């Protein structure tokens, strides 16, 4: 019985770990051994990965962990913050923050670290605006969010970065209980006012949103941009594209390719479950593995290929499937749309500043990324 997870390859470093991709060639599903030493069921094939995500005999063992109607409770509370018009309305400020950040990057020296100057700051600012942190508190919020993800930060640094983030979100929650605007925390604040969640639970959740949608999107920006640069054929397409429909699909094809969230929360089966030709005896653990699904040649004809015109690209599960899909979905999509198109058209001479093999990737972090991305232009 093999060990999970497995490590990515040099020379194929965008690719899912080859050892996982092999396993996935044999059986839509195989039994693995993990950190603690328990032996859960790694789901690899696309068709069955979607199924278990959408199967009630399956559930997850705060809204991250909460399940049952307990999850519907937590997740209904999140509907108002990420409606369509609620995210639509953010496209402008996503575009102003990007434009701002690209400028400051152009005005500085080069080679410049795209991670440092763009990939990290833009999500946490966008998350911020969605929450509704006042303008006054942008840089402090930024600081206490970018202290965590620094490759140079202590653990203590990361602790007393999060401590004051929870402390501040509680403040702003109460503040939005007082003065509700149209932002996200006002919505959480509206829920404290109805006996539904304490300030702590709301501060936790606000904190929860920042974490969830920061290093993820950051990593999509960074890795995404890199992937674009070694694939100039595609960079051109994304840059000259004239349809919002087509640029949206090119984001979908980037989420599928990079598949930064390789895993997916560790679920468990309540009843016995028969697919892939084996039986998931109830009780046993389930790991619904998204990279190999996104790289399943049954549904994505040339999975090693980065084809931004790829026909069914929003077929992927880079955001998960079923109950517990990424709540950030539409917002993160806007982010990558904005940032990708805008960088690629304002900086058409953007060039990778080192040999690719020099680039530092984020192996250990569950979410795959690059630690810094030097560009010239
Ligand atoms: C706007 C930015 C984002 C926000 C606010 C956000 C927030 C969240 C939250 C709260 C959840 C938990 C929902 C639940 O499990 O009930 C979640 C799940 C998830 N997120 Fe996102 N996220 C963001 C961006 C991303 C990105 C960019 C990716 C991948 C490229 C991603 C991948 C996922 C996946 C795969 C899940 C589902 C985990 C599972 O079903 O086990 N997220 N997100």
Swiss-Prot record:
Heme binds at residues 71, 265, 267, 324, 326. GO terms for molecular function: heme binding; iron ion binding; monooxygenase activity; oxidoreductase activity, acting on paired donors, with incorporation or reduction of molecular oxygen. Its cofactor is heme. Its EC number is 1.14.-.-. InterPro entries: Cyt_P450 (IPR001128), Cyt_P450_B (IPR002397), Cyt_P450_CS (IPR017972), Cyt_P450_sf (IPR036396). Pfam families: p450. Keywords: Heme, Iron, Metal-binding, Monooxygenase, Oxidoreductase. Belongs to the cytochrome P450 family. Can bind oleic-acid derivatives, amphotericin B like precursors and a variety of nitrogen ligand donors. This is Cytochrome P450 CYP105Q4.
């Amino acid at each position: 019985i093999p060990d999970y997870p497995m490590s990515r390859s040099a020379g194929c470093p965008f690719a899912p770990p080859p050892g996982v991709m092999a396993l996935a060639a044999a059986k839509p599903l195989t039994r693995v051994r993990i950190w603690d030493g328990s032996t859960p069921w790694l789901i690899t094939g696309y068709e069955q990965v979607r199924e278990l995500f959408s199967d009630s005999r399956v559930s997850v063992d705060s809204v991250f962990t909460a399940d049952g109607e307990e999850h519907t409770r937590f997740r209904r509370m999140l509907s108002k913050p990420f409606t369509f018009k609620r995210v639509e309305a953010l496209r402008p400020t996503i575009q102003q923050i990007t434009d701002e950040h690209i400028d400051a990057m152009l005005a500085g020296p080069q080679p410049a670290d795209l991670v440092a100057k763009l990939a990290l700051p833009v999500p946490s600012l966008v998350i911020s605006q969605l929450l509704g942190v006042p303008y006054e508190d942008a840089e402090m919020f930024q600081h206490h969010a970018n202290v965590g993800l620094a490759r140079y930060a202590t653990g203590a640094d990361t602790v007393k970065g999060a401590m004051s983030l929870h402390k501040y979100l509680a403040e702003l929650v109460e503040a939005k209980m007082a003065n509700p605007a149209e932002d996200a925390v006002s919505d959480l604040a509206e829920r404290v006012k109805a006996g539904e969640l304490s300030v702590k639970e709301a501060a936790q959740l606000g904190t929860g949103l920042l974490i969830a949608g920061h290093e993820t999107t950051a990593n999509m920006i960074g890795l995404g941009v890199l992937a674009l640069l070694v694939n100039p054929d595609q960079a051109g397409i994304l840059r000259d594209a004239q349809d919002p429909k087509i640029v949206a699909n090119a984001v979908e094809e980037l989420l599928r390719y990079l598949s930064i969230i390789q895993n997916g929360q560790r679920r468990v089966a309540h009843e016995d479950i028969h697919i892939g030709g084996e039986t998931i005896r109830a009780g046993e653990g389930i790991i619904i593995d998204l990279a190999p699904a996104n790289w399943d040649a049954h549904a994505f004809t040339e999975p090693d290929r980065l084809y931004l015109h790829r026909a069914g690209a929003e077929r992927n599960v880079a955001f998960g499937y079923g109950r517990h899909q990424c709540v950030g979905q539409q917002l993160a999509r806007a982010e990558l749309q904005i940032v990708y198109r805008t960088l690629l058209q304002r900086i058409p001479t953007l060039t990778l500043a080192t040999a690719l093999e020099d680039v530092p990737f984020k192996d250990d972090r569950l979410a795959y990324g690059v630690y810094e991305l030097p560009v010239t232009w």
